[PDB]
Amino acid sequence: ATTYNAVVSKSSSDGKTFKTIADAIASAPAGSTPFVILIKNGVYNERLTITRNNLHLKGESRNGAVIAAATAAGTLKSDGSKWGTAGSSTITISAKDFSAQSLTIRNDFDFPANQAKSDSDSSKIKDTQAVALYVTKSGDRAYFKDVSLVGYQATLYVSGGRSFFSDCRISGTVDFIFGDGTALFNNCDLVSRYRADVKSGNVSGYLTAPSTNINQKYGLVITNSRVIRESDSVPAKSYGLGRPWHPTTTFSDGRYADPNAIGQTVFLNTSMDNHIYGWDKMSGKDKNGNTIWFNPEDSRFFEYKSYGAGATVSKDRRQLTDAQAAEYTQSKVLGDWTPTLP
Ligand SMILES: COC(=O)[C@H]1O[C@H](O[C@@H]2[C@H](O)[C@@H](O)[C@@H](O[C@@H]3[C@H](O)[C@@H](O)[C@@H](O[C@@H]4[C@H](O)[C@@H](O)[C@@H](O[C@@H]5[C@H](O)[C@@H](O)[C@@H](O)O[C@@H]5C(=O)O)O[C@@H]4C(=O)OC)O[C@@H]3C(=O)OC)O[C@@H]2C(=O)OC)[C@H](O)[C@@H](O)[C@H]1O[C@H]1O[C@H](C(=O)O)[C@H](O)[C@H](O)[C@H]1O
Secondary structure, three states: OOOOOEEEOOOOOOOOOEOOHHHHHHOOOOOOOOEEEEEOOEEEEOOEEEOOOOEEEEEOOOOOEEEEEOOOOOOEOOOOOEOHHHHOOOEEEOOEOOEEEEEEEEEOOOHHHHHHOOOOOOOOOOOOOOOOEEEOOOOEOEEEEEEEEEOOOOOEEEOOOEEEEEOOEEEEOEEEEEEOOEEEEEOOEEEEOOOOOOOOOOOOEEEEEEOOEOOOOOOEEEEOOEEEEOOOOOOOOOEEEEOOOOOEEEEOOEEEEOOOEOOEEEEEOOEEOOOEEEOOOEEEEOOOOOEEEEOHHHOEEEEEOOEOOOOOOOOOOOEOOHHHHHHHOHHHHHOOOOOOOO
16 A cells, blocks of 8 residues: 655656655644655755655655755855755654655765865855755754665764665765764675875775764664775775764854764674775864864774775774674664554
8 A cells, every 4th residue: 555645757748746845745744643754756956954854755766856955064055154074964754753765865965076176266165064854963863765865975964863875875984984873784885986186195085984972872884785996096005984074163152163072883784895094073163162082992993894895804993793783783772662564
């Protein structure tokens, strides 16, 4: 039994369908009864914010149903202010029990074209993060199955509660999965992208930048997945598995890198190509305005039974025991929530 509350399509010959996704979402009665929207094949140039609980999107196919918009953090609004990282997102989830299935979500900000611009070009953006998908502090129980997420810097922003990504593709360069949420990935392709702007010998990017609060049990957990290069031009040892993001945060004694954001990234049973060199450090500003470095050895960065050419075991790459690995099942990570589609 599968039935839709609204249908979106590019055709008028399709019949009684909405022309935009935003229109179909807005049409949902107020409340928290399930609302299921079918999205037919096409590229929908839209930015969406989801505030209704129990909303569900289903694309006709991952290959053909695309929601896309180009916005960087350094892109300017009408009032001349920057959008910022959170504000750059193509899709923002600020509701509970959201699901998306069989669709692609992109931030189309052309990072390589931006980097190729001359340094004196006033249109060259420095704040190059450009989020495809953002799950906010208000999001919990967000389920993404057979979804593709496309960007370069800062593709996926996972904050708030629990999110589950299954049979997914996520592509990016720098910190392309980041934030303080509980985010479980199973059977996903994590695609590290080529950077034309990076000198031979320098780092191209980092898969994760977790900012998990030290008192939160689970951050970014990646299971049964594949960590792959976009192309043969992505150099060996060009990508880190993670670096520790301590976000600038307003405290009673000022605004500075959160010392208690000691992020967790755990890889279990995951293949890795040789573009991976291991973990890395990251800097912030301290309470005095000085540069402070946060080291991977002080973070919750672990692996369990990685394989492929990028899976080396050393003192700089801590490994879980069998008993420790048993703490990272779906049941333990997601707790009482069983992700289900309508
Ligand atoms: C989600 O989090 C983020 O997206 C993240 O974004 C920002 O990160 C910065 C930057 O965008 C990112 O690309 C990365 O950059 C590093 C490095 O930090 C940067 O200086 C640059 O370095 C290279 C090279 O890697 C290095 O070895 C060296 O090289 C030599 C020499 O020094 C140099 O001058 C040149 O001649 O080359 C020499 C050589 O060896 O050949 O320097 C070069 C260089 O170009 O320097 C000028 O590129 C690096 C890189 O590309 O790595 C893949 O990280 C940056 C960073 O961490 O800066 C502190 C942002 O800065 C981060 O804070 C983070 O942003 C989030 O958090 C913010 C916060 O305040 O908490 C905000 O909230 C923000 O909105 C949010 O997104």
